[PDB]
Amino acid sequence: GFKQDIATLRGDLRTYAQDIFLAFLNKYPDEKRNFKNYVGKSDQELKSMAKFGDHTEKVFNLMMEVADRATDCVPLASDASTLVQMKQHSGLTTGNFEKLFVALVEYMRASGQSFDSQSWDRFGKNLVSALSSAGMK
Numbered sequence: 394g395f396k397q398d399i400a401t402l403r404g405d406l407r408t409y410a411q412d413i414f415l416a417f418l419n420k421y422p423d424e425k426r427n428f429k430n431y432v433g434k435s436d437q438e439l440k441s442m443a444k445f446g447d448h449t450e451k452v453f454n455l456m457m458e459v460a461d462r463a464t465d466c467v468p469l470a471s472d473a474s475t476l477v478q479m480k481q482h483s484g485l486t487t488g489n490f491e492k493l494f495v496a497l498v499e500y501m502r503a504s505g506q507s508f509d510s511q512s513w514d515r516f517g518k519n520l521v522s523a524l525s526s527a528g529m530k
């Protein structure tokens with residue numbers, strides 16, 4: 394289920410983080426606006442860049458912690474607040490995070506693995522709600 398999925402993702406986090414983030418950037422190319430440094434690069438190019446690798450893995454590091462601290466796929470208010478008040482996210486709306494979670498769910502549905510896609514989908518909605526409550530537009 395959800396908790397095991399966390400363990401699975403963490404067992405190969407760098408690879409999962411990159412592949413899910415690339416699936417996000419490719420599904421929603423207009424989302425490349427928030428990452429100027431990534432424009433005009435194939436997936437392999439993006440993976441060569443140390444920053445892509447760095448940033449993305451740190452995103453998933455924190456995502457998995459938020460997932461880990463959730464109850465029944467409902468994240469802590471404190472975690473949502475942190476994500477909203479992060480300066481790197483000054484630009485973002487919950488639509489940005491929605492899209493990330495649609496691509497993550499899709500990724501999981503298309504994997505051969507028994508991910509609990511429905512829980513991640515609930516988790517994504519719950520987080521979007523919690524980001525709203527914590528003041529993200």
Ligand code: HEM
Pocket residue numbers: 424427428447448451452453455456459476481482485489490491493
């Ligand atoms: C659960 C969801 C998310 C988590 C846990 C998260 C976490 C993080 C973390 C930890 C960093 C800092 C990494 C560093 O210091 O280098 C970061 C930076 C950033 N995040 Fe997020 N993030 C999430 C969703 C998003 C989404 C949906 C977007 C845009 C649609 C976004 C855009 C960014 C940007 C633009 C940066 C700075 C860019 C850079 O220098 O590479 N994040 N995020």
